[PDB]
Design a protein around this ligand. Structure first.
Ligand SMILES: O=P([O-])([O-])O[C@@H]1[C@H](O)[C@H](O)[C@@H](O)[C@H](O)[C@H]1O
Ligand SMILES: O=P([O-])([O-])O[C@@H]1[C@H](O)[C@H](O)[C@@H](O)[C@H](O)[C@H]1O
Ligand SMILES: [Gd]
Ligand SMILES: [Gd]
Lengths: 272, 272
């Protein structure tokens, strides 16, 4: 899979070049599932580039992509080598020129992530990780923080793409519970993949969200764990990539403390 | 004042060097008024260095600084040339190595801000501005966004340092109102000066917060206005540097719409 990975890092650098030239030009901003769920022409054409470049070399592999699944294809994960692709994680940031947009590629065999690449192009930062070989940012090795005490922790989360009132209400009240423990603070940079990579560097101690998609987090998940962190469902159980919930933490102590405090928000799975 | 300014830029880059070597090393962390109100040896060290060098060169000038005030200096603003200094804005980020920390210097004469320097040392971004002469980042001219429609805007704000339940429930309540207009999103980078600087660049459309201090915002206020933005109190009235409250928006239409939406929290002034 090293060949696939070497190939992947090359693709991510290229698509990141496109995404970051587009960010300064005029854009066509269209609507997906609501007025706050967006897509531009660049999400679509970059996803097209990536899928056809991989298909060419690796014609037997399967794909799950955001804009593809939007175009009507289904998000069903099988045992076959599967590329899980977000062409632009942080599309609302992209549209606004808010300087955090990522290109994310995860690679799963036997329904398990083998390697991931997250390219944050505006910063010029390449995150990579392969199962068992560690996580790197631009060739330097990453490690999560050592904090085990929640009252001294710094968390990252997002408010989400939903504006359903009840949903919004549960999101804000889940925050209030954590904030009032108290923790040291909460941040949001606008993208799940980059939020997770900040955990891997040890910048933040933990990340949680409910409402993400499998393509948003498949690349960054293996980077956290190869950096020494942990992935967990919000029940405290094992991470389920298609479930739309994730806790990514420096360790199990903080991870279990967050699962304890927050309430579960009902969502449809990616595989439903 | 251009000499003071050229001086200011040199000081802020120097101190940014101190800050950004320190961030790599272990700190002993100290509390001030609460468990989440933090201070380190570097905050104190850097402020001391900064005040010494200025008053070496500018003996008649006054100073307002965060840690000075913590040592019992008072935050009364006169018409005298005054340097308003925050050695590290983002001390909680600093303690965590969350990669957004700034040195901030504003310079007021007749109790109006003449120039402002904000050095975000981890990114190597120097934001500067002088009344009537424009705003720049590393020699590149800044301009705020053109957004006049709140439903298509991206906001930045901070959850704040209070953990008083009543305050927190109002902070989140004000978030809910805005989120549900709806806006495109809300972000928090962890420092007021950098948040405001992202409004200046056009990355975000508006920033608001209640609970900040004069030193948090004295540098970045003129960077926003010289990029073409407006400052305004959350009440709708004019910006008061000592009031603990601020809206920094791209234009008057957004500033006034946000004020309409949110409710004011009672705060103790900086000059009381
Ligand atoms: O839509 P997208 O920009 O590709 O990805 C979204 C971003 O990561 C956002 O920050 C997060 O809150 C959402 O859950 C994601 O779906
Ligand atoms: O204490 P400090 O870190 O120097 O400054 C603080 C930061 O800018 C924070 O983002 C903001 O929410 C607080 O209101 C400020 O006081
Ligand atoms: Gd996306
Ligand atoms: Gd500070």
């Amino acid at each position: 899979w090293q060949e696939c990975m070497d190939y992947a890092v090359t693709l991510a650098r290229q698509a990141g070049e496109v995404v970051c030239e587009a960010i300064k030009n005029e854009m066509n901003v269209m609507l997906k599932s609501s007025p706050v769920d967006l897509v531009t022409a660049t999400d679509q054409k970059v996803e097209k580039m990536l899928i056809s470049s991989i298909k060419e070399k690796y014609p037997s592999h399967s794909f799950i992509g955001e804009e593809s699944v939007a175009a009507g294809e289904k998000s069903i994960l099988t045992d076959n080598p599967t590329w899980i692709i977000d062409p632009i994680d942080g599309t609302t940031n992209f549209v606004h020129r808010f300087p955090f947009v990522a290109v994310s590629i995860g690679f799963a065999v036997n329904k398990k992530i083998e390697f991931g690449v997250v390219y944050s192009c505006v910063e010029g930062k390449m995150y990579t990780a392969r199962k068992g070989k560690g996580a790197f940012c631009n060739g330097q090795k990453l490690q999560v923080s050592q904090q085990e005490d929640i009252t001294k922790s710094l968390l990252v989360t997002e408010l989400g793409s939903s504006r359903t009132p009840e949903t919004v209400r549960m999101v804000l009240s889940n925050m209030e519970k954590l904030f009032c423990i108290p923790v040291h603070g909460i941040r949001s940079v606008g993208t799940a993949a980059v939020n997770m990579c900040l955990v891997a560097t040890g910048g933040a101690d933990a990340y949680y969200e409910m409402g993400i998609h499998c393509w948003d987090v498949a690349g960054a998940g293996i980077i956290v764990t190869e950096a020494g962190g942990v992935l967990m469902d919000v029940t405290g159980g094992p991470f389920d990539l298609m479930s739309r919930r994730v806790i990514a933490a420096n360790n199990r102590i903080l991870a279990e403390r967050i699962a304890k405090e927050i309430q579960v928000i009902p969502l449809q799975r990616d595989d439903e």
